[PDB]
Amino acid sequence: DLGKKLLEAARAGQDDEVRILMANGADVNATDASGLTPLHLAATYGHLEIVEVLLKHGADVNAIDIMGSTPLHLAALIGHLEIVEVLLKHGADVNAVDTWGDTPLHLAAIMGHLEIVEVLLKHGADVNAQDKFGKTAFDISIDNGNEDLAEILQK
Amino acid sequence: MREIVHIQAGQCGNQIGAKFWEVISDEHGIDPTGSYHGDSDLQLERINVYYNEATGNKYVPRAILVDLEPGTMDSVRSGPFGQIFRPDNFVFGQSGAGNNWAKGHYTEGAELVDSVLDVVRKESESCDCLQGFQLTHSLGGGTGSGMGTLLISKIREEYPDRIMNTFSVMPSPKVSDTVVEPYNATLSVHQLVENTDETYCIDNEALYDICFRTLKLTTPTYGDLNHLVSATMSGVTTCLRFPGQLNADLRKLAVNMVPFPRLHFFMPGFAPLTSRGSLTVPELTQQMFDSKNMMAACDPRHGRYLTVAAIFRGRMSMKEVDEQMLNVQNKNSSYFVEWIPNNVKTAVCDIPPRGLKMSATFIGNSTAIQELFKRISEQFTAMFRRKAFLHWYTGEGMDEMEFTEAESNMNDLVSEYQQYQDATAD
Amino acid sequence: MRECISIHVGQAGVQIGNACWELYCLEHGIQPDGQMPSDKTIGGGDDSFNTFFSETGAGKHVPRAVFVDLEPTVIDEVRTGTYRQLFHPEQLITGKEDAANNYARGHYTIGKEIIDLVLDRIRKLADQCTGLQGFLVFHSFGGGTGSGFTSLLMERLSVDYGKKSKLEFSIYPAPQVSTAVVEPYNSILTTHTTLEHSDCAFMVDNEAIYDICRRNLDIERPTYTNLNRLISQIVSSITASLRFDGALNVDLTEFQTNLVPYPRIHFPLATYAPVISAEKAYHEQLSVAEITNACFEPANQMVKCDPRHGKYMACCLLYRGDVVPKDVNAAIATIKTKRSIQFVDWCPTGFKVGINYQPPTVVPGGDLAKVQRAVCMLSNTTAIAEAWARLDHKFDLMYAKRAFVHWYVGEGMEEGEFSEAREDMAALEKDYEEVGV
Ligand SMILES: Nc1nc2c(ncn2[C@@H]2O[C@H](COP(=O)(O)OP(=O)(O)OP(=O)(O)O)[C@@H](O)[C@H]2O)c(=O)[nH]1
Ligand SMILES: Nc1nc2c(ncn2[C@@H]2O[C@H](COP(=O)(O)OP(=O)(O)O)[C@@H](O)[C@H]2O)c(=O)[nH]1
Ligand SMILES: COc1ccc(/N=N/c2cc(OC)c(OC)c(OC)c2)cc1O
Ligand SMILES: [Ca+2]
Ligand SMILES: [Mg+2]
């Protein structure tokens, strides 16, 4: 089973090994116990070029783990602007919702990734989507007193 | 109550800890060579509080400089006052924590804590009547956070009848957009709740907002920020370093500022706000209570004041200060709790700091400080729910239960501030 | 005669004691180094001033006094001030670490370190008395040493000197010149633990003295030196009966006899007149009637309360200076008729009178003008209960929330003791209502 080896290779950032495993038939869309795919772990650890090569080889860009997290969610949380852009250009759902009601925009606002915040807004992020507690991205901004975030969401 | 053992740990702590000595040595007339070249007796009356006098009219700061990254000792030495510190107290490891709290608290830091405690005992034995311990550090890193809180706990064990006071820098994405800092702050706030008696909250979010929108600096550096930190630390230590009508010490502060043991997180403020390089009494009392002047990005008008201590510096009618301070408590009576009589205390100091001629420093125990802990906890919940980078902790020795417990203790603190925020007298 | 020892505790007790002994020197003709030219008997004496000053072989006159503080700074000023050569240097006792405005420290933790030495030093002064009457005790309410160490000391002396009376001068706190937010707690716990161990306590409300210093003396922002000079003149007029010739309040037994009908209601209210600024050096000299009628102006009281809304159980008049006994009668005879001054039904409606014919002394550098006659009225009125109610509610506002309580339990004290003391104050408030306020 090479799928268990691709998952660890993407996480570590070994580009040549990922090419090796895919050529030998490894499951690009395998999952670990928590439903994470190699695309999830490449995006979470900022290994951009592994993300890129995976997309051109059939990876499911909207694959959700057992908590409903898409690769775009994890990229926005950790704050990887380029990978955020690459995912959106490869069919990522900008307003996907995990099991806590969070969209990616929810996560980029909470962590202060104001650059990624602007990107999501331009690419269709809904400013009206509520989490489980019923807070939009703007609702989050006024609560924690983030005037920089508030300005970006009003425009 | 005379002697204080000042410690500075990690990159941030040593940076603000070195600025602290640079500003108070100037105030007390001490030069980079340890010589006293002042012209006032008021600078040496309580000079022993922070300085160990030596031979040849030398004054060595009672300071213990700690870090895991060996580079920090180099940046401190190349500073103007970088050779006044006793070389024996310099304790620096070889492998930094790399923004990992577990390395600071459990592995890399824990192998070096005995080297620091040995130094603490040396300085504490030279104390005729030691008050307690002081620390400057960050919460969002690995050394000042992880190792700093371990040191606070171990010193607590060997000197339980002394007071521990910390200067603690709260992380902000506006100054450091690193996602592991919510974990490290929450793990650090959990420790500060149990182990310290009083903690000053110096939030990098507030420092950024002050430098960027109030002072108009489009790209603040660690200089613009620490210019605010070192001034605050001058204010809240004034009545410890100069005679004054009160014999204020770390315990008299604690007993009258801390109504319940866990609510010892203060919100310091400073007036006037000013940038480096580049005022009547009713203005000073006004600006001192303004949200724009707080060193923690909380709006005090969203909560109530449990206790306040405000110190002025310079030449001004002490009678006018009394009238203005009584005026603030009459026109803002809905922001001070009614079930603590005479909960505001004022002191005036003759010698102002540098540059400025007037000074006003604010120390608040405000229920609005929950907004800070809410902001951090929101960032911690998002990271921890996705288990992001959690293996960087359990791989050092931690277990997942230490994350939930520090998280459980943090949100309790928010409920406690809200409770007393709604408590009435009737 | 019969000797008196004065114990001064904490900063406030020491700073008042320093000013009081200064005034005592001037009034008696004692020079700062102890010599007393008018004392015709060297090395001994049976005079009335020997209640306060023992004598050595070289003609020195040394106060019967002890000064105790847990920190050194305040007493170090007395060890090196003007009257440094006056006191027994062994009776100037200091620790290193004060009580941090915490009753529990002063009484339990820190106070334990020095309570034995304090007594042995007291014992050395007692060894020199022929017939000790008892003790004068000067201490703050709101401080940690003034409260906690005082009550521990009063507990000890009541075991070791069971036949000697105790009289306290205790400074009641005010927010104007206050120190600690916890001073209500300290004052309630010191009142409970000392109540059974003190015969008569003279309270001094800092709020009352502060206002008199501002009004009658035109001092914009009084300092503790300003307050303590006025306090000492009032203390002098209250203790003069022990130090000079006289027929009223001649010893500590009679203070209890005249002023305290029931032992728990032992808090007399002192009123004093006239108070006139030294800048009015050419003031007209008020008459006996004027200064006597001024003993019923609430302004001139050392504890802010309204004796109109109360009943008197005792009323003594202490005059100093140019005072004709007949003039006292006409001034009082008006008070019994024209003014509404109610005594309780069970007390002989009468004013006891003492007259000392020398005018009061003023200290050089003071704030008071010289006057030809003055009067100190010691009464016992139910209206002082108002001062207890004012303090008891400030306690209630914090105690309901248990604010600051862990500071006490963490210093050797049981949380319940708060409740036993507060009920004791409720019983005292009922004590004054039962008597008739
Ligand atoms: N009238 C008067 N009051 C004073 C003086 N000094 C302090 N006080 C009052 O006494 C109270 C404080 O208690 P202190 O006697 O200073 O405390 P302490 O006995 O020294 O005990 P510590 O807590 O150990 O310092 C406050 O209410 C002050 O307003 C003084 O010189 N004169
Ligand atoms: N205000 C201020 N914050 C700092 C400074 N240096 C680092 N920090 C903050 O401290 C946190 C990182 O901790 P740091 O002291 O740099 O690393 P450590 O050695 O592990 O303690 C981050 O939140 C930084 O933003 C400084 O000079 N001033
Ligand atoms: C409301 O009740 C109180 C609260 C705080 C009290 N004073 N604490 C201090 C005050 C200081 O400056 C004003 C200070 O200098 C910065 C200080 O240094 C340690 C202590 C006293 C109170 O009675
Ligand atoms: Ca004689
Ligand atoms: Mg004291």
Within 13 Å of residue B132, how many CA atoms lie on the same side as its CB? 22
How many angstroms separate the CA atoms of B107 and B121, rounded? 22
Distances from the Cα of B239 to the Cα of B245, B286, B310, C76, C320, angstroms: 9, 22, 11, 20, 45
B173 to A112: CB separation less than 8 angstroms, yes or no: yes
Q: Which helix (H) or strand (E) holds A22?
A: helix A15-23
Distances from the Cα of B334 to the Cα of B304, B330, C334, angstroms: 8, 9, 51
How many angstroms separate the CA atoms of C353 and C243, rounded? 17
C221 to B322: CB separation less than 8 angstroms, yes or no: yes
Distances from the Cα of C242 to the Cα of C2, C22, C28, C236, C420, angstroms: 9, 17, 13, 10, 36
How many angstroms separate the CA atoms of B226 and B19, rounded? 8
Nearest residue on chain B to C73, alpha-carbon basis? B247
User: In Å, how far from its chain's centre is CA B226?
Assistant: 12
Residue pair B295/B327 in contact by the 8 Å Cβ criterion: no
How many angstroms separate the CA atoms of B46 and C161, rounded? 42
How many angstroms separate the CA atoms of B340 and C423, rounded? 21
How many angstroms separate the CA atoms of B321 and B282, rounded? 8
Interface of A with B (CB under 8 A): 44, 67, 69, 73-74, 77-79, 100, 102, 107, 110-113, 140, 143-145, 147-148
| Distance between B123 CA and the closest CA of chain C, angstroms | 19
| Distance between C362 CA and the closest CA of chain B, angstroms | 27
How many angstroms separate the CA atoms of C273 and B151, rounded? 62
Q: Quickly count: other Cβ atoms within 10 Å of residue B121's Cβ.
A: 13
Give just the sign of the alpha carbon dihedral A81, A87, A89, A93: negative
Work out the angle between the directed axes of helices C183-195 and C417-435 (0-180°, nearest 10).
70
Interface test with A, best of B181, B374, B385 (most A CBs within 10 A): B385
Partnered with residue B6 across adjacent β-strands are B63, B134
Partnered with residue B60 across adjacent β-strands are B52
Clarify whether residues B13 and B53 are in a common domain: yes
CATH code at position B362: 3.30.1330.20
Closest CA to B129 of B63, B207, B65, B49: B49
Give just the sign of the alpha carbon dihedral B212, B217, B222, B224: negative
Tell me C49's DSSP state. G
Clarify whether residues B316 and B392 are in a common domain: no
Using DSSP bridges, classify how beta strands C373-381 and C312-321 pair: parallel, antiparallel or unpaired.
antiparallel
- Tell me which of B320, B335, B368 is where a domain ends: B368
How many angstroms separate the CA atoms of B228 and B169, rounded? 12
CATH code at position B64: 3.40.50.1440
> Which residues in chain A are contacts of B382 at CB distance < 8 A?
77, 102, 107, 110-111
A74 to B383: CB separation less than 8 angstroms, yes or no: no
How many angstroms separate the CA atoms of B363 and B235, rounded? 9
Q: Which helix (H) or strand (E) holds C156?
A: helix C150-160
Residue showing tokens 């603000």 = B16
- With respect to CATH, is domain A1-155 assigned 3.40.630.10? no
| Residue B147, domain extent | 2-259
Closest CA to C268 of C377, C172, C345: C377
Residue pair B68/B95 in contact by the 8 Å Cβ criterion: yes
How many angstroms separate the CA atoms of B279 and B409, rounded? 43
Instruction: Name the residue among A69, A113, A145 with its Cβ closest to that of B371.
Output: A145
3-state helix, strand, coil split of chain C in percent (to 5) is 45, 15, 40
How many angstroms separate the CA atoms of B192 and C269, rounded? 50
Residues B348-365 as b/e (b if ≥16 CB within 10 A, e otherwise) read bbebbbeeeebbbbbbbb
Residue pair B153/B191 in contact by the 8 Å Cβ criterion: yes
> Which residues in chain C are contacts of B254 at CB distance < 8 A?
407
Closest CA to C59 of C81, C26, C80, C31: C31
How many angstroms separate the CA atoms of B147 and B151, rounded? 6
How many angstroms separate the CA atoms of B87 and B60, rounded? 10
SS (H, E, C) chain B: CCEEEEEEEHHHHHHHHHHHHHHHHHHCCECCCCEECCCCHHHCCCHHHCEEECCCCEEEECEEEEECCCCHHHHHHCCCCCCCCCHHHCEECCCCCCCCHHHHHCCHHHHHHHHHHHHHHHHHHCCCCEEEEEEEEECCCCHHHHHHHHHHHHHHHHCCCCEEEEEEEECCCCCCCCCCHHHHHHHHHHHHHHHCCEEEEEEHHHHHHHHHHHCCCCCCCHHHHHHHHHHHHHHCCHHHHCCCCCCCCHHHHHHHHCCCCCCCEEEEEEECCCCCCCCCHHHHHHHHCCHHHECCCCCHHHCCEEEEEEEEECCCCHHHHHHHHHHHHHHCHHHECCCCCCCEEEEEECCCCCCCCCEEEEEEEEHHHHHHHHHHHHHHHHHHHCCCCCHHHHCCCCCHHHHHHHHHHHHHHHHHHHHHHHCCCC
CATH code at position B408: 1.10.287.600
Which chains does C contact via 3+ CB–CB distances below 8 A? B
How many interchain CB pairs under 8 A, A with B? 48
How many angstroms separate the CA atoms of B101 and B181, rounded? 9
Closest CA to C154 of C353, C7, C361: C7
Residue pair C91/C84 in contact by the 8 Å Cβ criterion: no
Using DSSP bridges, classify how beta strands C134-140 and C165-172 pair: parallel, antiparallel or unpaired.
parallel
Residue C140 marked in a binding site: yes
Closest CA to C194 of C255, C149, C134: C149
Partnered with residue B91 across adjacent β-strands are B66
How many angstroms separate the CA atoms of B333 and B367, rounded? 15
Partnered with residue C136 across adjacent β-strands are C6, C167
Tell me C146's DSSP state. I
Give just the sign of the alpha carbon dihedral B346, B349, B354, B355: positive
Residue pair B344/B366 in contact by the 8 Å Cβ criterion: no
How many angstroms separate the CA atoms of C136 and B403, rounded? 61
How many angstroms separate the CA atoms of B65 and C83, rounded? 48
Cis ω before B341 (30° cut-off from 0): no
Instruction: Name the residue among A44, A113, A144 with its Cβ closest to that of B177.
Output: A113
B303: Cβ contacts below 8 Å, ≥ 6 apart: B335, B366, B367, B368, B369, B370, B371, B417, B421
Distances from the Cα of B187 to the Cα of B149, B150, C295, angstroms: 9, 11, 66
CATH class (in words) of the domain with range C384-437: mainly alpha
DSSP C356-414: E-SPPP--TT-SBPP-SEEEEEEEEEGGGHHHHHHHHHHHHHHHTTTTTTHHHHTTT--
Q: Quickly count: other Cβ atoms within 10 Å of residue C46's Cβ.
A: 8
Residue pair C288/C324 in contact by the 8 Å Cβ criterion: yes
Query: Please, which experimental method was used?
Result: X-ray
| N-terminal to C-terminal alpha carbon distance within chain C | 40
How many angstroms separate the CA atoms of C295 and C272, rounded? 6
Q: Which ligand is nearest to the CA of B249?
A: 3
CB of B102 within 6 A of ligand 2: the answer is: no
Give just the sign of the alpha carbon dihedral B134, B139, B141, B145: positive
Decide if C386 is catalytic: no
Closest CA to B306 of B413, B421, B189, B167: B421
C74: Cβ contacts below 8 Å, ≥ 6 apart: C10, C11, C14, C15
Closest CA to B148 of B180, B196, B183: B196
| N-terminal to C-terminal alpha carbon distance within chain B | 39
Work out the angle between the directed axes of helices B181-195 and B370-385 (0-180°, nearest 10).
130
Tell me A16's DSSP state. H
Of C3, C113, C196, C254, the catalytic one is C254
Q: Residues of B comprising the binding site for Mg(2+)?
A: 69
Q: Read off the tokens for C235.
A: 């203390």
User: In Å, how far from its chain's centre is CA C281?
Assistant: 28
Residue pair C203/C170 in contact by the 8 Å Cβ criterion: yes
C101 to B252: CB separation less than 8 angstroms, yes or no: yes
Q: Read off the tokens for B399.
A: 């277990």
| Fold topology of C1-268 | Rossmann fold (3.40.50)
Closest CA to C118 of C8, C246, C238: C8
How many angstroms separate the CA atoms of A71 and A7, rounded? 14
How many angstroms separate the CA atoms of B87 and B106, rounded? 26
How many angstroms separate the CA atoms of A13 and B328, rounded? 59
DSSP A49-105: HHHHHHHTTT--TT---TT---HHHHHHHHT-HHHHHHHHHTT--TT---TTS--HH
Closest CA to B165 of B63, B253, B269, B46: B253
How many angstroms separate the CA atoms of C196 and C263, rounded? 8
Using DSSP bridges, classify how beta strands C312-321 and C352-356 pair: parallel, antiparallel or unpaired.
parallel
Q: Read off the tokens for B204.
A: 């990098």
How many angstroms separate the CA atoms of B348 and B310, rounded? 9
Atom of ligand 1 nearest to the CA of C178: 29
Say whether C172 sits in a helix, a strand or coil: strand
Clarify whether residues B169 and B291 are in a common domain: no
How many angstroms separate the CA atoms of C202 and C269, rounded? 7
Say whether C124 sits in a helix, a strand or coil: helix
Say whether C169 sits in a helix, a strand or coil: strand
Within 13 Å of residue A56, how many CA atoms lie on the same side as its CB? 7
Residue showing tokens 């940038």 = B275
How many angstroms separate the CA atoms of A92 and C39, rounded? 107
Q: Read off the tokens for B271.
A: 């007036």
How many angstroms separate the CA atoms of A16 and C355, rounded? 111
Q: Read off the tokens for C4.
A: 């008196």
CB of B189 within 6 A of ligand 3: the answer is: no
- Tell me which of B207, B238, B259 is where a domain ends: B259
Distances from the Cα of B10 to the Cα of B96, B152, B188, B256, C377, angstroms: 9, 14, 14, 31, 67
Q: Would you call C214 exposed, middle or buried from its count of C-beta atoms within 10 A (0-12, 13-18, 19+)?
A: middle
Closest CA to C97 of C122, C118, C114: C114
How many angstroms separate the CA atoms of C72 and C97, rounded? 8
Which of these CATH numbers, 2.40.100.20, 3.20.20.140, 3.30.1330.20, 3.40.50.720, describes C269-383? 3.30.1330.20
Clarify whether residues B383 and B423 are in a common domain: yes
Q: Report residues whose beta carbon is within 6 angstroms of any ligand 1 atom.
A: C 10-12, 15-16, 70, 98-101, 140, 142-146, 171, 173, 177-179, 183, 206, 224, 227-228, 231
Domain spans of chain C, in order of start: 1-268, 269-383, 384-437
